[PDB]
From a paper:
The binding of RBD to the receptor hACE2 is an essential step for virus to entry cell, thus we first explored if the binding of six SARS-CoV-2 variant (including Alpha, Beta, Gamma, Mink-Y453F, Mink-F486L and Mink-N501T) RBDs to hACE2 were changed in comparison with wild-type (WT) SARS-CoV-2 (the first strain of SARS-CoV-2 which was isolated from a clinical patient on Jan 6, 2020, GISAID: EPI_ISL_402119) RBD. Given that residues at positions 417, 453, 486, and 501 are involved in the interactions between the RBD and human ACE2 (hACE2), it is important to understand the detailed binding of these novel variant RBDs to hACE2. To further elucidate the molecular mechanism underlying the binding of these SARS-CoV-2 variant RBDs to hACE2, we prepared for RBD-hACE2 complexes and obtained five crystal structures, namely Alpha RBD-hACE2, Beta RBD-hACE2, Gamma RBD-hACE2, Mink-Y453F RBD-hACE2, and Mink-F486L RBD-hACE2 at a resolution of 2.9 Å, 2.6 Å, 2.8 Å, 2.4 Å, and 2.7 Å, respectively. Each complex structure was comprised of one copy of the RBD-hACE2 molecule in one asymmetric unit.
Residue numbers in the entry:
A (entry chain B): 333 to 527
B (entry chain A): 19 to 614
Write the structure that this text describes.
Amino acid sequence: TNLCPFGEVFNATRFASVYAWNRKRISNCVADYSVLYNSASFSTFKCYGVSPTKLNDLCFTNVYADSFVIRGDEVRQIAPGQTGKIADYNYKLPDDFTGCVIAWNSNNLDSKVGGNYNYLYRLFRKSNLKPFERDISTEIYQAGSTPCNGVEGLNCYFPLQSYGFQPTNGVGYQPYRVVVLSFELLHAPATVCGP
Amino acid sequence: STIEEQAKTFLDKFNHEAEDLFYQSSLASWNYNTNITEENVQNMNNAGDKWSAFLKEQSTLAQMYPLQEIQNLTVKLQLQALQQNGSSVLSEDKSKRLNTILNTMSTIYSTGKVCNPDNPQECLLLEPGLNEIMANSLDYNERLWAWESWRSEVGKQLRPLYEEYVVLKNEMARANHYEDYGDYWRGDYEVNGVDGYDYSRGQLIEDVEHTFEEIKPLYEHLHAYVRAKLMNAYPSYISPIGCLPAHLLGDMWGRFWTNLYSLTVPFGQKPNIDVTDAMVDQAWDAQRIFKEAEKFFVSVGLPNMTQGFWENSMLTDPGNVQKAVCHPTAWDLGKGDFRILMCTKVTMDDFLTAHHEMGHIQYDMAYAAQPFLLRNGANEGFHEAVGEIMSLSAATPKHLKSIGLLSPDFQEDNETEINFLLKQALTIVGTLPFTYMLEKWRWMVFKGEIPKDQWMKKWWEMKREIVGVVEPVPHDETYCDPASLFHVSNDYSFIRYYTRTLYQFQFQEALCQAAKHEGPLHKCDISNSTEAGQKLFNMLRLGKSEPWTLALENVVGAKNMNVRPLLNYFEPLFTWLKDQNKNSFVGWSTDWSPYA
Ligand SMILES: *[C@@H]1O[C@H](CO)[C@@H](O)[C@H](O)[C@H]1NC(C)=O
Ligand SMILES: *[C@@H]1O[C@H](CO)[C@@H](O)[C@H](O)[C@H]1NC(C)=O
Ligand SMILES: *[C@@H]1O[C@H](CO)[C@@H](O)[C@H](O)[C@H]1NC(C)=O
Ligand SMILES: *[C@@H]1O[C@H](CO)[C@@H](O)[C@H](O)[C@H]1NC(C)=O
Ligand SMILES: [Zn+2]
């Protein structure tokens, strides 16, 4: 009766920046998924492929928990076949995604009077992300044709921008903590069942 | 990557950077305006200075993308708006001289004082001192003393500064490839490169003058009726054929004729609809007033206020020692933060103002999804036009009866309707010749058509001919009477009050037709009409992203400013005035003056 360490993921003190989204591999434990979906503490709980309704009657080889912070209007981008700054440059879900996306408003924790600038996102990139790709580079983005020489200037921008999370922002601009559960199925042990 | 692609990426960085820097400055400005302290003044300046410095830097960087190589119009609009040099096309010395001139004229206006003869310590400022005289006094000499002293003491200080201000403003405008500073102001209506919706700067002069010609008959009869009533009150001071003396108009300039209502009211025995007592009888507070305004916009299909609005706004006077600037304002801070600042009292006036101010919020919320630089009204007259129509509907007896403030046993008779329309005309119609004549004078000064040694000669020639108003004391060229009004000495364009007035009745007529209103336009209430709300919202969400000609067409079906809805609104008064003036002289001679 090893219980899956979901508390470390959902109840973490600080979440990761979405450009550097955090992944926690969950293995060899018992997951009570129904506690999450029947807790009524999340504003978004949408599953694709699998069903939130009592599908903790299944076994999976590995479960991955991706967590990060984005603003409320960007939670829509954490879904298959979505475009936008988050989906293209920071965190991209595949078209055939099998898993769940969970998000809740964290204005009480991730906002601060005067502004919380701890959380960043990638604003520019040469191309779009492959599904489940992570780019933590800090290379100055070359928008023109003149080399940047590693500093920002004309047509040269440092690629990461900061959210300014203030408690008085609108709901669309408030911070939201996101957890993305991936359910993997290999021709393999199937170690995470979780009655 | 092409020049256009670089501009898109550049604007991408600007929007995200500006959003937060603007928010920081709005937040600091809010904290001072609700809580007046020395520390808040400094924080307001520091955040404001950083935002201004950011804009100056980004304006220079924007100028390195030439508009000639951009085809996407929505990119060109944002690039052009940021690129505008403003005063930064002049040398630093000239720029500095102009900024010193602007601050001095502003300081003279807001600290200028007048002291009564024989007591050099009994002095009055314009606000509230001189304004109280000009809005409330019936004594001819007290009004004349206030009118002349303001112009003779404060106006004369402004004359040399205003002369130098014109020279530097024209240099700035010509360096920006405008004809003059007036042509620069008219650029707010310019539209290029949109087939069927373009509008030139010179077309505004023609359209203002063309629509003003159609206003003259209504104004002439409004002028004639007012002159007759004042002649009954002041038989020795008013000629039956002459202009109205400039100090007998209800405020310092005759900008509005509102305060002439008591001496000109047609039927002085029928009282106004004043719904204030019913509000107090039902124990209304400020939150109720704004809840009712919210209910109004929801009834036409617009969204309710955000949660932050109720939590972060200041809807009442904070009171004890935390002082606040009580002028009603609607705040768009960005980042979904919408607030209203208002020291609300339980009165009918503040009830209507809340609907007006919440109208701005509805406009601000609707174009929030637009890029930062396009988050504004289609032109300088749209936002205030949107606010005004909300109070038109909210004030009608039909609306006040449906919310339980006006008795069901109150029915409209035609005498109260004439009283109301006359009161409306004194404010709305009376200001139109004043506004057009004032802006025409500034246009001609900037154009070079009025030499310095004839500034005040032409100013009062145009007051007599166009406005039908005559100065009570001759003024030589040491005076600068136009600068004695806030907007002239504080460098604000003025035609916006003319165009907005025509826009608001175009909006209201279109919305009321969508609301299937039957009867005279002035009795219309757009409440409960989602068709009207949808028609208005289609323009609101545009912001500045489309030509103002297109945005107007979304509401009213026409591409240009049209005076007919304004005349439709006032038609019952117009027919009543024409019958009243049958045994009066209509029009004015310009050669009569009170100083003979
Ligand atoms: C987080 O903490 C709360 C309160 O201690 C608890 O109810 C909840 O189950 C925790 N989250 C997880 C994923 O266990
Ligand atoms: C007013 O501002 C001061 C600082 O200038 C601050 O300490 C105080 O809490 C403020 N009061 C209110 C009611 O906001
Ligand atoms: C202009 O650019 C924006 C974003 O770069 C794009 O969405 C829009 O369709 C473009 N308009 C035209 C006419 O190309
Ligand atoms: C506004 O209306 C929505 C329904 O569209 C509702 O969920 C929300 O609670 C309302 N908010 C307020 C402040 O009335
Ligand atoms: Zn307003």
